[PDB]
Amino acid sequence: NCLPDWSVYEGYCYKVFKERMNWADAEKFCTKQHKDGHLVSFRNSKEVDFVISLAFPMLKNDLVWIGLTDYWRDCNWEWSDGAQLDYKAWDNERHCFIYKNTDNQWTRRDCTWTFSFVCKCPA
Amino acid sequence: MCPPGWSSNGVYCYMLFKEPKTWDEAEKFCNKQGKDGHLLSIESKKEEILVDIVVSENIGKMYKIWTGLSERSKEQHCSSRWSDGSFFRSYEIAIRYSECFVLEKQSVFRTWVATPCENTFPFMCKYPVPR
């Protein structure tokens, strides 16, 4: 169901890596490991537990990147004076998703820093 | 041609008020000073610059200043996407909701930071003389 050294779960393959990369590079590295592979995504098919309990014991178990960069968008913010939101000065590097094993929950952090990663691709 | 105490830029009048208020109340306050006054909107690096400096000179220190960047509360229409699927199952310590943005003294008031609307912070009003 998966290639050697990749765990199986609900039709998805998961592999852990001990490298330290910024969000962007992590995603790229993942896409390179196998077709349709990306930074792990969580929808709670109880992947969390699995990913952290099985697809993690093979890892430093900390802080792994999550494949979600919730960058501020025009879709949900606007000026009270109805002026268009062209120029923006909000931080874009802030908001890369992350899973903190010690807090057993996600967190938003600078996309520019480094973290371990778990790639994932549907079989 | 702006009122006394107010400053001009791009044919717009601006004033920083050293009176801590909620996003809502400050916004309301600005709409009472002149037809169509509002919390300041920032449309260019040049303007962003004209505002921080007006903040820097007229407001006795504070960490944040209210601008009129408000959340549209359209989340269900602005669903984020994972590098593939949809962002539904989420798990963060989303304390209280922060549907407001203000200017931070940390970055000399040039950058924006998501903050709780209910917080009381000084503010900057703005309005066009031509109504």
PDB file of N, CA and C in Angstrom, chain A residues 33-98:
ATOM      1  N   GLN A  33       9.749  13.815  -2.625  1.00  0.00           N
ATOM      2  CA  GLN A  33       9.858  12.448  -2.136  1.00  0.00           C
ATOM      3  C   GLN A  33       9.045  11.418  -2.901  1.00  0.00           C
ATOM      4  N   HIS A  34       7.845  11.797  -3.324  1.00  0.00           N
ATOM      5  CA  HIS A  34       6.959  10.865  -4.017  1.00  0.00           C
ATOM      6  C   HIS A  34       5.854  11.667  -4.704  1.00  0.00           C
ATOM      7  N   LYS A  35       5.215  11.079  -5.708  1.00  0.00           N
ATOM      8  CA  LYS A  35       4.147  11.794  -6.391  1.00  0.00           C
ATOM      9  C   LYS A  35       3.018  12.130  -5.418  1.00  0.00           C
ATOM     10  N   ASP A  36       2.399  13.286  -5.627  1.00  0.00           N
ATOM     11  CA  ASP A  36       1.295  13.731  -4.787  1.00  0.00           C
ATOM     12  C   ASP A  36       1.635  13.879  -3.298  1.00  0.00           C
ATOM     13  N   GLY A  37       2.922  13.875  -2.964  1.00  0.00           N
ATOM     14  CA  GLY A  37       3.322  14.041  -1.577  1.00  0.00           C
ATOM     15  C   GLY A  37       3.355  15.519  -1.212  1.00  0.00           C
ATOM     16  N   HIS A  38       2.978  15.837   0.023  1.00  0.00           N
ATOM     17  CA  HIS A  38       2.960  17.218   0.517  1.00  0.00           C
ATOM     18  C   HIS A  38       3.197  17.187   2.023  1.00  0.00           C
ATOM     19  N   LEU A  39       3.372  18.357   2.635  1.00  0.00           N
ATOM     20  CA  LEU A  39       3.544  18.417   4.082  1.00  0.00           C
ATOM     21  C   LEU A  39       2.272  17.787   4.598  1.00  0.00           C
ATOM     22  N   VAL A  40       2.357  17.034   5.684  1.00  0.00           N
ATOM     23  CA  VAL A  40       1.165  16.390   6.207  1.00  0.00           C
ATOM     24  C   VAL A  40       0.025  17.366   6.473  1.00  0.00           C
ATOM     25  N   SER A  41      -1.197  16.902   6.229  1.00  0.00           N
ATOM     26  CA  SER A  41      -2.392  17.695   6.482  1.00  0.00           C
ATOM     27  C   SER A  41      -3.219  16.886   7.473  1.00  0.00           C
ATOM     28  N   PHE A  42      -3.960  17.559   8.344  1.00  0.00           N
ATOM     29  CA  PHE A  42      -4.780  16.846   9.320  1.00  0.00           C
ATOM     30  C   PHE A  42      -6.255  17.210   9.242  1.00  0.00           C
ATOM     31  N   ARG A  43      -7.093  16.186   9.157  1.00  0.00           N
ATOM     32  CA  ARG A  43      -8.531  16.376   9.076  1.00  0.00           C
ATOM     33  C   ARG A  43      -9.205  15.605  10.217  1.00  0.00           C
ATOM     34  N   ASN A  44      -8.360  14.965  11.019  1.00  0.00           N
ATOM     35  CA  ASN A  44      -8.751  14.170  12.179  1.00  0.00           C
ATOM     36  C   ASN A  44      -9.351  12.804  11.891  1.00  0.00           C
ATOM     37  N   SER A  45      -8.842  12.139  10.859  1.00  0.00           N
ATOM     38  CA  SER A  45      -9.285  10.785  10.560  1.00  0.00           C
ATOM     39  C   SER A  45      -8.450  10.051  11.608  1.00  0.00           C
ATOM     40  N   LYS A  46      -8.205  10.771  12.703  1.00  0.00           N
ATOM     41  CA  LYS A  46      -7.398  10.323  13.825  1.00  0.00           C
ATOM     42  C   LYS A  46      -5.972  10.146  13.349  1.00  0.00           C
ATOM     43  N   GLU A  47      -5.600  10.982  12.381  1.00  0.00           N
ATOM     44  CA  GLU A  47      -4.262  10.962  11.812  1.00  0.00           C
ATOM     45  C   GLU A  47      -3.318  11.490  12.870  1.00  0.00           C
ATOM     46  N   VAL A  48      -3.778  12.499  13.599  1.00  0.00           N
ATOM     47  CA  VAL A  48      -2.967  13.110  14.637  1.00  0.00           C
ATOM     48  C   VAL A  48      -2.343  12.027  15.495  1.00  0.00           C
ATOM     49  N   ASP A  49      -3.181  11.342  16.265  1.00  0.00           N
ATOM     50  CA  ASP A  49      -2.714  10.265  17.123  1.00  0.00           C
ATOM     51  C   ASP A  49      -1.749   9.382  16.343  1.00  0.00           C
ATOM     52  N   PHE A  50      -2.212   8.821  15.232  1.00  0.00           N
ATOM     53  CA  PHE A  50      -1.352   7.962  14.430  1.00  0.00           C
ATOM     54  C   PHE A  50      -0.040   8.649  14.080  1.00  0.00           C
ATOM     55  N   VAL A  51      -0.140   9.761  13.356  1.00  0.00           N
ATOM     56  CA  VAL A  51       1.037  10.509  12.943  1.00  0.00           C
ATOM     57  C   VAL A  51       1.974  10.757  14.109  1.00  0.00           C
ATOM     58  N   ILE A  52       1.430  11.164  15.250  1.00  0.00           N
ATOM     59  CA  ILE A  52       2.274  11.425  16.409  1.00  0.00           C
ATOM     60  C   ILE A  52       2.633  10.170  17.209  1.00  0.00           C
ATOM     61  N   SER A  53       1.785   9.146  17.150  1.00  0.00           N
ATOM     62  CA  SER A  53       2.034   7.916  17.901  1.00  0.00           C
ATOM     63  C   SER A  53       2.764   6.824  17.121  1.00  0.00           C
ATOM     64  N   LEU A  54       2.691   6.871  15.794  1.00  0.00           N
ATOM     65  CA  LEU A  54       3.365   5.877  14.958  1.00  0.00           C
ATOM     66  C   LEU A  54       4.260   6.533  13.916  1.00  0.00           C
ATOM     67  N   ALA A  55       3.728   7.540  13.231  1.00  0.00           N
ATOM     68  CA  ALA A  55       4.491   8.258  12.217  1.00  0.00           C
ATOM     69  C   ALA A  55       5.251   9.404  12.887  1.00  0.00           C
ATOM     70  N   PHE A  56       5.642   9.189  14.141  1.00  0.00           N
ATOM     71  CA  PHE A  56       6.378  10.187  14.906  1.00  0.00           C
ATOM     72  C   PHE A  56       7.434   9.543  15.797  1.00  0.00           C
ATOM     73  N   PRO A  57       7.136   8.363  16.373  1.00  0.00           N
ATOM     74  CA  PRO A  57       8.129   7.709  17.229  1.00  0.00           C
ATOM     75  C   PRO A  57       9.412   7.484  16.441  1.00  0.00           C
ATOM     76  N   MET A  58       9.300   7.613  15.125  1.00  0.00           N
ATOM     77  CA  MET A  58      10.436   7.465  14.230  1.00  0.00           C
ATOM     78  C   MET A  58      10.985   8.869  14.013  1.00  0.00           C
ATOM     79  N   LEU A  59      10.629   9.763  14.931  1.00  0.00           N
ATOM     80  CA  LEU A  59      11.049  11.155  14.870  1.00  0.00           C
ATOM     81  C   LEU A  59      11.355  11.742  16.246  1.00  0.00           C
ATOM     82  N   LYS A  60      12.093  12.845  16.231  1.00  0.00           N
ATOM     83  CA  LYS A  60      12.487  13.572  17.429  1.00  0.00           C
ATOM     84  C   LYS A  60      11.273  13.963  18.274  1.00  0.00           C
ATOM     85  N   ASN A  61      10.095  13.661  17.796  1.00  0.00           N
ATOM     86  CA  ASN A  61       8.886  14.036  18.565  1.00  0.00           C
ATOM     87  C   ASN A  61       8.950  15.378  19.333  1.00  0.00           C
ATOM     88  N   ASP A  62       8.696  16.517  18.576  1.00  0.00           N
ATOM     89  CA  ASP A  62       8.628  17.927  19.061  1.00  0.00           C
ATOM     90  C   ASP A  62       7.317  18.765  18.598  1.00  0.00           C
ATOM     91  N   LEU A  63       7.620  19.484  17.558  1.00  0.00           N
ATOM     92  CA  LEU A  63       7.487  20.353  16.419  1.00  0.00           C
ATOM     93  C   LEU A  63       7.679  19.985  14.950  1.00  0.00           C
ATOM     94  N   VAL A  64       6.599  19.546  14.307  1.00  0.00           N
ATOM     95  CA  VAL A  64       6.619  19.162  12.896  1.00  0.00           C
ATOM     96  C   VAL A  64       5.812  20.196  12.099  1.00  0.00           C
ATOM     97  N   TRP A  65       6.228  20.478  10.867  1.00  0.00           N
ATOM     98  CA  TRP A  65       5.497  21.429  10.038  1.00  0.00           C
ATOM     99  C   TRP A  65       4.167  20.818   9.633  1.00  0.00           C
ATOM    100  N   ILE A  66       3.181  21.683   9.473  1.00  0.00           N
ATOM    101  CA  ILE A  66       1.860  21.284   9.040  1.00  0.00           C
ATOM    102  C   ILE A  66       1.696  21.998   7.703  1.00  0.00           C
ATOM    103  N   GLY A  67       1.149  21.301   6.714  1.00  0.00           N
ATOM    104  CA  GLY A  67       0.991  21.885   5.392  1.00  0.00           C
ATOM    105  C   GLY A  67      -0.092  22.931   5.216  1.00  0.00           C
ATOM    106  N   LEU A  68      -0.079  23.954   6.063  1.00  0.00           N
ATOM    107  CA  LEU A  68      -1.074  25.014   5.978  1.00  0.00           C
ATOM    108  C   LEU A  68      -0.503  26.382   6.343  1.00  0.00           C
ATOM    109  N   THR A  69      -0.461  27.288   5.367  1.00  0.00           N
ATOM    110  CA  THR A  69       0.014  28.647   5.608  1.00  0.00           C
ATOM    111  C   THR A  69      -1.197  29.564   5.428  1.00  0.00           C
ATOM    112  N   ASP A  70      -1.805  29.887   6.556  1.00  0.00           N
ATOM    113  CA  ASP A  70      -2.995  30.712   6.620  1.00  0.00           C
ATOM    114  C   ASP A  70      -2.669  32.216   6.492  1.00  0.00           C
ATOM    115  N   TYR A  71      -2.098  32.605   5.356  1.00  0.00           N
ATOM    116  CA  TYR A  71      -1.722  34.000   5.116  1.00  0.00           C
ATOM    117  C   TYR A  71      -2.943  34.904   5.033  1.00  0.00           C
ATOM    118  N   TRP A  72      -2.830  36.105   5.588  1.00  0.00           N
ATOM    119  CA  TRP A  72      -3.942  37.053   5.570  1.00  0.00           C
ATOM    120  C   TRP A  72      -4.419  37.228   4.138  1.00  0.00           C
ATOM    121  N   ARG A  73      -5.729  37.309   3.961  1.00  0.00           N
ATOM    122  CA  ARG A  73      -6.306  37.468   2.636  1.00  0.00           C
ATOM    123  C   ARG A  73      -7.369  38.566   2.594  1.00  0.00           C
ATOM    124  N   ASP A  74      -7.642  39.056   1.388  1.00  0.00           N
ATOM    125  CA  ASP A  74      -8.619  40.119   1.154  1.00  0.00           C
ATOM    126  C   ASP A  74     -10.035  39.598   1.367  1.00  0.00           C
ATOM    127  N   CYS A  75     -10.191  38.291   1.213  1.00  0.00           N
ATOM    128  CA  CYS A  75     -11.485  37.637   1.357  1.00  0.00           C
ATOM    129  C   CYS A  75     -12.177  37.883   2.692  1.00  0.00           C
ATOM    130  N   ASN A  76     -11.408  38.134   3.747  1.00  0.00           N
ATOM    131  CA  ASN A  76     -12.033  38.326   5.047  1.00  0.00           C
ATOM    132  C   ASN A  76     -11.679  39.609   5.800  1.00  0.00           C
ATOM    133  N   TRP A  77     -10.965  40.527   5.164  1.00  0.00           N
ATOM    134  CA  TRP A  77     -10.626  41.775   5.845  1.00  0.00           C
ATOM    135  C   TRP A  77     -10.831  42.963   4.917  1.00  0.00           C
ATOM    136  N   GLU A  78     -11.250  44.095   5.481  1.00  0.00           N
ATOM    137  CA  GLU A  78     -11.475  45.288   4.684  1.00  0.00           C
ATOM    138  C   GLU A  78     -11.439  46.571   5.502  1.00  0.00           C
ATOM    139  N   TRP A  79     -11.302  47.692   4.795  1.00  0.00           N
ATOM    140  CA  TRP A  79     -11.257  49.002   5.424  1.00  0.00           C
ATOM    141  C   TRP A  79     -12.677  49.451   5.784  1.00  0.00           C
ATOM    142  N   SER A  80     -12.800  50.164   6.893  1.00  0.00           N
ATOM    143  CA  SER A  80     -14.101  50.641   7.319  1.00  0.00           C
ATOM    144  C   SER A  80     -14.592  51.706   6.350  1.00  0.00           C
ATOM    145  N   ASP A  81     -13.679  52.348   5.631  1.00  0.00           N
ATOM    146  CA  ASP A  81     -14.095  53.386   4.690  1.00  0.00           C
ATOM    147  C   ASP A  81     -14.330  52.830   3.290  1.00  0.00           C
ATOM    148  N   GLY A  82     -14.478  51.512   3.206  1.00  0.00           N
ATOM    149  CA  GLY A  82     -14.738  50.851   1.941  1.00  0.00           C
ATOM    150  C   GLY A  82     -13.662  50.946   0.879  1.00  0.00           C
ATOM    151  N   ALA A  83     -12.503  51.502   1.218  1.00  0.00           N
ATOM    152  CA  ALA A  83     -11.411  51.611   0.254  1.00  0.00           C
ATOM    153  C   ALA A  83     -10.841  50.218   0.017  1.00  0.00           C
ATOM    154  N   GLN A  84     -10.426  49.943  -1.213  1.00  0.00           N
ATOM    155  CA  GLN A  84      -9.880  48.640  -1.547  1.00  0.00           C
ATOM    156  C   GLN A  84      -8.585  48.354  -0.797  1.00  0.00           C
ATOM    157  N   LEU A  85      -8.369  47.081  -0.469  1.00  0.00           N
ATOM    158  CA  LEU A  85      -7.190  46.653   0.270  1.00  0.00           C
ATOM    159  C   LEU A  85      -6.031  46.250  -0.639  1.00  0.00           C
ATOM    160  N   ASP A  86      -5.456  47.234  -1.314  1.00  0.00           N
ATOM    161  CA  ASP A  86      -4.329  46.995  -2.201  1.00  0.00           C
ATOM    162  C   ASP A  86      -3.089  46.829  -1.328  1.00  0.00           C
ATOM    163  N   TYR A  87      -2.404  47.933  -1.067  1.00  0.00           N
ATOM    164  CA  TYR A  87      -1.226  47.917  -0.228  1.00  0.00           C
ATOM    165  C   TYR A  87      -1.563  47.282   1.130  1.00  0.00           C
ATOM    166  N   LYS A  88      -0.721  46.355   1.571  1.00  0.00           N
ATOM    167  CA  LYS A  88      -0.911  45.694   2.854  1.00  0.00           C
ATOM    168  C   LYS A  88       0.431  45.635   3.572  1.00  0.00           C
ATOM    169  N   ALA A  89       0.405  45.783   4.890  1.00  0.00           N
ATOM    170  CA  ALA A  89       1.637  45.779   5.667  1.00  0.00           C
ATOM    171  C   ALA A  89       1.596  44.777   6.811  1.00  0.00           C
ATOM    172  N   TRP A  90       0.792  43.733   6.653  1.00  0.00           N
ATOM    173  CA  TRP A  90       0.690  42.696   7.666  1.00  0.00           C
ATOM    174  C   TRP A  90       1.800  41.691   7.407  1.00  0.00           C
ATOM    175  N   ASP A  91       2.176  40.930   8.426  1.00  0.00           N
ATOM    176  CA  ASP A  91       3.242  39.956   8.254  1.00  0.00           C
ATOM    177  C   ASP A  91       2.751  38.706   7.537  1.00  0.00           C
ATOM    178  N   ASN A  92       3.463  38.331   6.481  1.00  0.00           N
ATOM    179  CA  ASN A  92       3.133  37.160   5.679  1.00  0.00           C
ATOM    180  C   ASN A  92       3.862  35.918   6.191  1.00  0.00           C
ATOM    181  N   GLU A  93       5.055  36.115   6.743  1.00  0.00           N
ATOM    182  CA  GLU A  93       5.835  35.000   7.263  1.00  0.00           C
ATOM    183  C   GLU A  93       5.184  34.400   8.494  1.00  0.00           C
ATOM    184  N   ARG A  94       4.368  35.191   9.173  1.00  0.00           N
ATOM    185  CA  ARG A  94       3.678  34.692  10.345  1.00  0.00           C
ATOM    186  C   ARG A  94       2.525  33.872   9.808  1.00  0.00           C
ATOM    187  N   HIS A  95       2.128  32.848  10.555  1.00  0.00           N
ATOM    188  CA  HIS A  95       1.006  31.986  10.195  1.00  0.00           C
ATOM    189  C   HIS A  95       1.242  30.610   9.607  1.00  0.00           C
ATOM    190  N   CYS A  96       2.480  30.146   9.557  1.00  0.00           N
ATOM    191  CA  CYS A  96       2.638  28.798   9.055  1.00  0.00           C
ATOM    192  C   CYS A  96       2.205  27.883  10.185  1.00  0.00           C
ATOM    193  N   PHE A  97       1.362  26.916   9.855  1.00  0.00           N
ATOM    194  CA  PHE A  97       0.868  25.982  10.851  1.00  0.00           C
ATOM    195  C   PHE A  97       1.949  25.034  11.344  1.00  0.00           C
ATOM    196  N   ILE A  98       1.787  24.601  12.585  1.00  0.00           N
ATOM    197  CA  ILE A  98       2.735  23.703  13.200  1.00  0.00           C
ATOM    198  C   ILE A  98       2.100  22.893  14.316  1.00  0.00           C
TER     199      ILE A  98
END
